[PDB]
Amino acid sequence: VPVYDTCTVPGSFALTFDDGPYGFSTRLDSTLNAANAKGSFFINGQNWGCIYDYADVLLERFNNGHFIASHTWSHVHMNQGTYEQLSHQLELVEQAMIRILGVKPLYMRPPYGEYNDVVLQVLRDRGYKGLIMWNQDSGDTFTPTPSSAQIIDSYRSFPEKTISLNHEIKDFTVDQVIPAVIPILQQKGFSLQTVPECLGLSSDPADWYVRVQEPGTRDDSWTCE
Ligand SMILES: O=C(NO)c1cccc2ccccc12
Ligand SMILES: [Zn+2]
């Protein structure tokens, strides 16, 4: 399975968001959509909320050409797990996306950016097409944490083909950083693309997933208990 950390499409720029969805996701997607900007979202199953409580956000996200990929169910340190536990950690997210969206993800980003040969083998065995890292960090989860003004200023010097790490669980990333940096990046000539598109893989959203069955209706299996 290939590991990617940089776009290849001239002029592209990938805004990426980990650990979501969260209570600010509708705001964040509204801001992206109003600018025709596409985000890449590496979601959790049970971490900062249960993925099934976010089904409506996920469906809006899915149908608006945003890229949805796995960040594992529980946000585990994957270098610490057995093959089986990692298969389970991925599987649970696949299951939720199958129930809510009808599809399986084909990509993932490891929690903490930590991975090893076992992770890569599990991904290969489960049909994944890539492990997505990044090449610039917003710093929105550093501690102590930079100000929004500092983060925005960092973005003024991130170059073309950046894959930028952000976390949708941070209110200031959603409400201050991203509304400021979308115009900065678009006005200087960058095209705010999903990761697969900026890698020269497909720009068709249907190519980022495997269709499994029709989307389900909410029932009592839509739970993280
Ligand atoms: O999982 C992460 N971002 O989504 C993450 C990526 C890179 C470094 C980290 C350090 C502490 C906690 C999390 C992370
Ligand atoms: Zn994370």
Side-chain angles (χ1 to χ4, degrees), residues 156-169:
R156 285 180 188 105
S157 69
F158 288 163
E160 70 158 355
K161 297 170 179 182
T162 287
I163 301 185
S164 68
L165 176 64
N166 308 265
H167 307 72
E168 82 183 293
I169 59 189

Side-chain angles (χ1 to χ4, degrees), residues 66-140:
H66 302 290
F67 173 54
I68 301 171
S70 169
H71 200 36
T72 76
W73 183 260
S74 313
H75 200 286
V76 298
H77 288 276
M78 293 180 89
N79 288 354
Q80 295 302 128
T82 70
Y83 181 100
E84 296 73 15
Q85 288 166 322
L86 298 183
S87 197
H88 187 39
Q89 279 288 318
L90 289 169
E91 195 270 329
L92 290 175
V93 173
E94 300 171 21
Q95 268 313 94
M97 290 178 66
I98 291 169
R99 288 183 163 122
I100 299 167
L101 310 176
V103 307
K104 279 197 294 179
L106 287 169
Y107 301 90
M108 71 87 60
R109 170 172 289 166
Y112 319 100
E114 299 176 341
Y115 66 88
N116 60 14
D117 281 359
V118 178
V119 174
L120 293 167
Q121 190 62 54
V122 182
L123 291 179
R124 174 52 161 133
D125 297 343
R126 293 201 67 87
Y128 285 76
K129 293 205 208 181
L131 183 158
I132 306 311
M133 294 291 296
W134 60 87
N135 63 13
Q136 303 289 348
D137 195 332
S138 69
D140 64 350

